[PDB]
Design a protein around this ligand. Structure first.
Ligand SMILES: *[C@@H]1O[C@H](CO)[C@@H](O[C@@H]2O[C@H](CO)[C@@H](O)[C@H](O)[C@H]2NC(C)=O)[C@H](O)[C@H]1NC(C)=O
Ligand SMILES: *[C@@H]1O[C@H](CO)[C@@H](O[C@@H]2O[C@H](CO)[C@@H](O)[C@H](O)[C@H]2NC(C)=O)[C@H](O)[C@H]1NC(C)=O
Ligand SMILES: *[C@@H]1O[C@H](CO)[C@@H](O[C@@H]2O[C@H](CO)[C@@H](O)[C@H](O)[C@H]2NC(C)=O)[C@H](O)[C@H]1NC(C)=O
Ligand SMILES: *[C@@H]1O[C@H](CO)[C@@H](O)[C@H](O)[C@H]1NC(C)=O
Ligand SMILES: *[C@@H]1O[C@H](CO)[C@@H](O)[C@H](O)[C@H]1NC(C)=O
Ligand SMILES: *[C@@H]1O[C@H](CO)[C@@H](O)[C@H](O)[C@H]1NC(C)=O
Ligand SMILES: *[C@@H]1O[C@H](CO)[C@@H](O)[C@H](O)[C@H]1NC(C)=O
Ligand SMILES: *[C@@H]1O[C@H](CO)[C@@H](O)[C@H](O)[C@H]1NC(C)=O
Ligand SMILES: *[C@@H]1O[C@H](CO)[C@@H](O)[C@H](O)[C@H]1NC(C)=O
Ligand SMILES: *[C@@H]1O[C@H](CO)[C@@H](O)[C@H](O)[C@H]1NC(C)=O
Ligand SMILES: *[C@@H]1O[C@H](CO)[C@@H](O)[C@H](O)[C@H]1NC(C)=O
Lengths: 726, 147, 49
C-alpha cells in the first residue's frame, strides 16, 4: 500500500476542550453573482466576449454560506497547554452535488483572536481541512462523525505551500484523549509554529503527524501532494464527484485574480460520497504570540441555469442566476444584461396548497380464500375473482408464496398495490416454471397464443410463484398441461382456420379438451354444428412434469371508475381530523380514489343525485355529492398572475399582481413564485401595498399626476412614471 | 473464484417491520448493500441484515445472494465505456504518423483534421490569442469551433 | 464478484487494444452507440474498463 511513513510515536493525544460558544459570530457573505463569485468555469472550452447561457452546478446567488474559523488553542505564558477548539467536529453534512469554498477573503484586515478576542489581533489567511466518505456513525463514547471504510482526507500540511490528500482507513487509538480511549472528548489536529514552518526548513510533515496522533492509518490506497506558494489573496476551491471520479477545482492556478474555478486536479476514487465534514484544527503558539485568522466559508452547489458574461479575455466577469428573481427571469429570456424598458409577464404563483382530505371507503376485507386450497387450473381452465366493495393488503398475500417473477405493464407495482379501483381482478393458475420463458403479457409463446390473453386497455401485472412447504392445503396437478394448438378444420378438407385466444376469454377449444392432457402431443376433435357451417374443432396439447413444490402464476388487471371505486387498500382515517365540510382554500383530495386539488363550497345539488361526482364538457370535475347529504361545488384553486414594470433608464422596477387585489396580498408569499422577491423590497419593505383599478401594485406611489404618455402605461388610465433622469 | 456469485437482494425494511423498500443500483456505482455483503457469497441463498440507526433513518438493511459453479478455465466479463471531453481528449490509439509529412501547417486548403481526437474540417490562420489559456479549443455561441 | 468491481481508467496515453484482446478468447462482443471497431479507433478524454 502507500508509504505514509511511520506510525505515531505515541498513542496518547492532547486533550481537547470544546470552547464553541466563543466562536459564535455573525459575518455572512452572500454571493456577488454580478462579480461571478463562485462561478465554475465551463469544461474545456473558451469564449470571446459573447454572452451565453449555460447549465451546470453553481452556488445560489443569495447563499450567505457556512462560516468556520480556525483558532489558536490554549497556551499561557511562554508555553503550550490544552486545545481550545470549536465544536465543528460534530458538523456532519450530507454530500450534495459538491461544494465550493471561500478562503482568506478577510486578509489585510483585523479582527479578534476569538478564543481570546480581547487581543484584537490582525487576521491572515489559513487553509481548511476536510474529510469525506460513504458513511458516518457514533464514536464508542457516542460522539458524532466517526467514519467507516476508507475516507478522503484533505489537509494542508505545515505551511500552506504544501497540500496533501489521502484515501485510507482510519483507526481509533487507546491513548488518553484519543478515540478508543475512554478519556476522549473530540478529535482535533494541530500545528506548532514555534518549530513548525522554520524559514529555512518548513515542516512538511507537521499536520499529518498531529493527525496520526489520534488515528492509525491502515490500507492507504492513495496519496497526493501539491505545490502552493504563499499569497494572502483570496482563493476559491471546491469539490465535485462524477462517474469519472472526484474532481478538485481551484482558482489559484489560472485565475487567481478573478476567482474563476478550474479543474486543478482529479482523484481516482470511485466510491460515492455520502457525507462531508470539516476537520477542526488549532494553533499551539505561545500566548503572547497568538495570531487571529481570517474567516473561512462554504457554499452548496446545485444544477442551476446561468447567464454568463465572458470577457474577451475569457474570464467570466458577470453572471445571472435565472431563478433568483422574476427580474432575473427576464434577463435570462432575453439573454442579456439590459432588457428594454417595458412591462413584462413573469411566471404566476402556485396559490398555497394545504393538507389532504378523503371520502373513500367503505367495505370489508376482500376474501382471498379461493387461493388457499385445492389444485390450481391448467392454463386453459382459469379461475377468476372479481373484487368489489372490499379492502385489501396484498403484502399479506405475498407472504404466502415465494415470488419468482414480478412484472407490471403500464403501472408501477407499488402503485397498483396502493391504488383504489372500481374493480380488482385476479386470475390464477397452476404453471410450471419450466414454461416461464414462454410467458409475459407480450409473449409469443403458445400459452398466450392459445390459452390466455390480457387486454391492454387496463394496466396489468403478472406474478409467478411457488408454494411453501407449510401451505399443503394447496395441491399439485397430476401434470402441468397446456393447449399448444387451437384451430378448426374447414368443411372442405383442404384448409384450416387458426383460433388465437381472445383477450379476457377462454379459448373455444376448451369445450373438447380434457381437464388435463393425458399425454404430451395429444389432440382432440369435435364436429362443428351446422349452425357453424360444419367443419371440425381441433386442439392439441402438451404436458410438463409435476414438481416438488407447486408452481403457479397470476394475472392481475384493474378497472378504473369514479363512483364505482369501492375496491381499495385497507384504509385508516384517524386524525384527518376532518374531511369534506372543512375548508380550506386549496387542499389535496381523493374521493373514492379520484385524486385532485381544490376548494369546496356548500352549494345546491344539481342532478343526477347519487351519481358521485359531476363534470363539465371538458371532463373537469365540477362538484361532488357526499354522505353528509351536502353537494359541494369545486373551484380547484385560483393562481395569481404576475407582471413586472421595468425602467432601464433609472434601473428600477415595480410590480403588479393583476386582478387579485391587495386583499390576498401579504409581505411574503408561500404561494409561491421565485425563491425571493427582495429586489422589490429594496423600496417596498418600507411601504404598504397599493390598490389600483387594474389591480394591487407594489412600489408605485399615488402621486395623482396627470401625464399624457408615460411610455409605460398600465392599461386603462393607469400610468407609471419613471423617476426623473440622473 | 471458488464460485461465481452475485447479490440478488438489497432493500430496507421499514422500522414497523412490515413495509419494505428496494434499493436499486446507481449507474456506474457500487450498490449501498456492499457494506454488509461478504466479498464472495459463501452459499447460495445466503442473507444478512443490519439494524439501522435513527441517524440512518431506522429500519433494517436486508440483502442476499446466489452462486454459480466454478469452471476449468476462468470465465470473465468486461464493461467498456468511453468519455469524450473537450481539451482533455488525450486518450488515443498509438499514432501512425511515421513515414508521412510535416504537420500541421499547409495554408493551403480547408483540410480535414484531428486535434487530440477532435475531428473537423477547416483552414487555419495566423491569429492573435483571445481568452483563455490552456482551454485549447475556442467556440462561438453556435457551438462551432472558432480556433 | 459483480458487486466488487474493479475499474481502470486511462487518460493521457496511447493504445493498441487488439493486442490486449489477443490475450483472451472472446465469445461475446457487442456495443451500443458505437461500432465495436470504432471504439478502438476513436480518441477520447477517457477510456474506462
Ligand atoms: C465584442 O462584442 C461586441 C458586440 O457587442 C463587438 O462590438 C463592439 O463592442 C465594444 C464594447 O462594447 C464597443 O465599444 C464597440 O463600439 C462595438 N463595436 C460596434 C461596431 O458596435 C466587439 O467587436 C467584440 N469584440 C471582439 C474583440 O470581438
Ligand atoms: C513541487 O513539489 C515537490 C514535492 O511535492 C518538490 O520536490 C522536492 O522538494 C524539496 C523541498 O526542498 C526539494 O529539496 C527536492 O529537491 C524536490 N525534489 C525534486 C525537485 O525532485 C518541488 O520542489 C516542488 N516545486 C517545484 C517542482 O517547483
Ligand atoms: C493585502 O493583501 C492583498 C492580497 O490579499 C494584497 O494584494 C496584492 O498586492 C500586491 C502588492 O501591491 C499587488 O501587486 C497585487 O496585485 C495584489 N493582488 C494579488 C497578489 O492577487 C494587498 O496589497 C495587501 N495590502 C497590504 C496593505 O498589505
Ligand atoms: C455545537 O454543536 C451542535 C450540534 O450538537 C450544533 O447544533 C451547534 O450549532 C454548535 N454550536 C454552538 C452551540 O454554538
Ligand atoms: C490492507 O491491509 C490488510 C491488513 O489486514 C490486508 O489484509 C490487505 O491485503 C491490505 N490491502 C491492500 C494492501 O490493498
Ligand atoms: C339439429 O342440429 C343441427 C345443428 O346443431 C342441425 O343439423 C339441425 O338443423 C338441428 N335441428 C333443427 C330442427 O334445427
Ligand atoms: C350546507 O350543507 C348542509 C348539509 O351538510 C345543508 O343542510 C345546508 O342547507 C347547506 N347550506 C347552504 C347555504 O347551502
Ligand atoms: C390615490 O389618489 C387619488 C387622487 O384623488 C385618490 O382619489 C385615491 O383615493 C388615492 N388612493 C387610491 C388607492 O387610489
Ligand atoms: C465498510 O463499512 C461497513 C459498514 O459501514 C462494514 O460493515 C464493512 O465491513 C466495511 N468494509 C470493509 C471494512 O472492508
Ligand atoms: C448515536 O447515534 C444516534 C443515531 O441517531 C444519535 O441519535 C445519538 O445522538 C448518538 N449518540 C448517542 C450517545 O446515542
Ligand atoms: C503568427 O504566427 C507566427 C507563427 O506562425 C507567430 O510567430 C506570430 O506571433 C503570429 N502573429 C501574431 C500577430 O502573433
Amino acid at each position: 500500500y502507500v508509504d505514509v511513513g511511520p506510525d505515531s510515536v505515541k498513542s496518547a493525544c492532547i486533550e481537547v476542550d470544546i470552547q464553541q460558544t466563543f466562536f459564535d459570530k455573525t459575518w455572512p457573505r452572500p454571493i456577488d453573482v454580478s462579480k461571478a463569485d463562485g462561478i465554475i468555469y465551463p469544461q474545456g472550452r473558451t469564449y470571446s466576449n459573447i454572452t451565453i447561457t449555460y447549465q451546470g452546478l453553481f452556488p445560489y446567488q443569495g447563499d450567505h454560506g457556512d462560516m468556520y474559523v480556525y483558532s489558536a488553542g490554549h497556551a499561557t505564558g511562554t508555553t503550550p497547554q490544552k486545545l481550545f477548539v470549536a465544536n465543528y467536529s460534530q458538523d456532519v453534512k450530507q454530500f450534495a452535488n459538491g461544494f465550493v469554498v471561500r478562503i482568506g477573503a478577510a486578509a489585510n484586515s483585523t479582527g479578534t483572536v476569538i478564543i481570546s478576542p480581547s487581543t484584537s489581533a490582525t487576521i491572515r489567511k489559513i487553509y481548511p481541512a476536510f474529510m469525506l466518505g460513504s458513511s458516518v456513525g457514533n464514536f464508542s463514547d457516542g460522539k458524532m462523525g466517526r467514519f467507516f471504510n476508507h475516507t478522503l482526507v484533505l489537509l494542508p500540511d505545515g505551511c500552506g505551500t504544501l497540500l496533501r490528500a489521502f484515501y485510507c482507513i482510519l483507526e481509533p487509538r487507546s491513548g488518553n484523549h484519543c478515540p478508543a480511549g475512554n478519556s476522549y472528548t473530540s478529535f482535533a489536529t494541530y500545528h506548532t509554529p514555534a518549530t513548525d514552518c522554520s524559514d529555512g526548513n518548513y515542516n512538511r510533515n507537521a499536520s499529518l503527524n498531529s493527525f496520526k496522533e489520534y488515528f492509525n492509518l491502515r490500507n492507504c490506497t492513495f496519496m497526493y501532494t501539491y505545490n502552493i506558494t504563499e499569497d494572502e489573496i483570496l482563493e476559491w476551491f471546491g469539490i465535485t464527484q462524477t462517474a469519472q471520479g472526484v474532481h478538485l477545482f481551484s482558482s489559484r492556478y489560472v485565475d487567481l485574480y478573478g476567482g474563476n474555478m478550474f479543474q486543478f486536479a482529479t482523484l481516482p476514487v470511485y466510491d460515492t460520497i455520502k457525507y462531508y465534514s470539516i476537520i477542526p484544527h488549532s494553533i499551539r503558539s505561545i500566548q503572547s504570540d497568538r495570531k487571529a485568522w481570517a474567516a473561512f466559508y462554504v457554499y452548496k452547489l446545485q444544477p442551476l441555469t446561468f447567464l454568463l458574461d465572458f470577457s474577451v479575455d475569457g474570464y467570466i466577469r458577470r453572471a445571472i442566476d435565472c431563478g433568483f428573481n422574476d427580474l432575473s427571469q427576464l434577463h435570462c429570456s432575453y439573454e442579456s444584461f439590459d432588457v428594454e424598458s417595458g412591462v413584462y409577464s413573469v411566471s404566476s404563483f402556485e396559490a398555497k396548497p394545504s393538507g389532504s382530505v378523503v371520502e373513500q371507503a367503505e367495505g370489508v376485507e376482500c376474501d382471498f380464500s379461493p387461493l388457499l386450497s385445492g389444485t390450481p387450473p391448467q392454463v386453459y381452465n382459469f379461475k377468476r375473482l372479481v373484487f368489489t366493495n372490499c379492502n385489501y393488503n396484498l403484502t399479506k398475500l405475498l407472504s404466502l408464496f415465494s415470488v419468482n417473477d414480478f412484472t407490471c405493464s403500464q403501472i408501477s407495482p407499488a402503485a397498483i398495490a396502493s391504488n383504489c379501483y372500481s374493480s380488482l381482478i385476479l386470475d390464477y393458475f397452476s404453471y410450471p416454471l419450466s414454461m416461464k420463458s414462454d410467458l409475459s403479457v407480450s409473449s409469443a409463446g403458445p400459452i398466450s397464443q392459445f390459452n390466455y390473453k390480457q387486454s391492454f386497455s387496463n394496466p396489468t401485472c403478472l406474478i409467478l410463484a411457488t408454494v411453501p412447504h407449510n401451505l399443503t392445503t394447496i395441491t399439485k396437478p397430476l401434470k402441468y398441461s397446456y393447449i399448444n394448438k387451437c384451430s378448426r378444420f374447414l368443411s372442405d378438407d383442404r384448409t384450416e382456420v387458426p383460433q388465437l385466444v381472445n383477450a379476457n376469454q377462454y379459448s373455444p377449444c376448451v369445450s373438447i379438451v380434457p381437464s388435463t392432457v393425458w399425454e404430451d402431443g395429444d389432440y382432440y376433435r369435435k364436429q362443428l354444428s351446422p349452425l357453424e357451417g360444419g367443419g371440425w374443432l381441433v386442439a392439441s396439447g402438451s404436458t410438463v412434469a409435476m414438481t416438488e413444490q407447486l408452481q403457479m402464476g397470476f394475472g392481475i388487471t384493474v378497472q378504473y371508475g369514479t363512483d364505482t371505486n369501492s375496491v381499495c387498500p385497507k384504509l385508516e382515517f384517524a386524525n384527518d381530523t376532518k374531511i369534506a365540510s372543512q375548508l380550506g382554500n386549496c387542499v389535496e383530495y381523493s374521493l373514492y380514489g379520484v385524486s385532485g386539488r381544490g376548494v369546496f363550497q356548500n352549494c345546491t345539488a344539481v342532478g343526477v343525485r347519487q351519481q358521485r361526482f359531476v363534470y363539465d364538457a371538458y371532463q373537469n370535475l365540477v362538484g361532488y355529492y357526499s354522505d353528509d347529504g351536502n353537494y359541494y361545488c369545486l373551484r380547484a384553486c385560483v393562481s395569481v398572475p404576475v407582471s413586472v414594470i421595468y425602467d432601464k433608464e433609472t434601473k428600477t422596477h415595480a410590480t403588479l399582481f393583476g386582478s387579485v387585489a391587495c386583499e390576498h396580498i401579504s409581505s411574503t408569499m408561500s404561494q409561491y413564485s421565485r425563491s425571493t422577491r427582495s429586489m422589490l423590497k429594496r423600496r417596498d419593505s418600507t411601504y404598504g401595498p397599493l390598490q389600483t383599478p387594474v389591480g394591487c401594485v407594489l412600489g408605485l406611489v399615488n402621486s395623482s399626476l396627470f401625464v399624457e404618455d408615460c411610455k409605460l402605461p398600465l392599461g386603462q388610465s393607469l400610468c407609471a412614471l419613471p423617476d426623473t433622469p440622473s
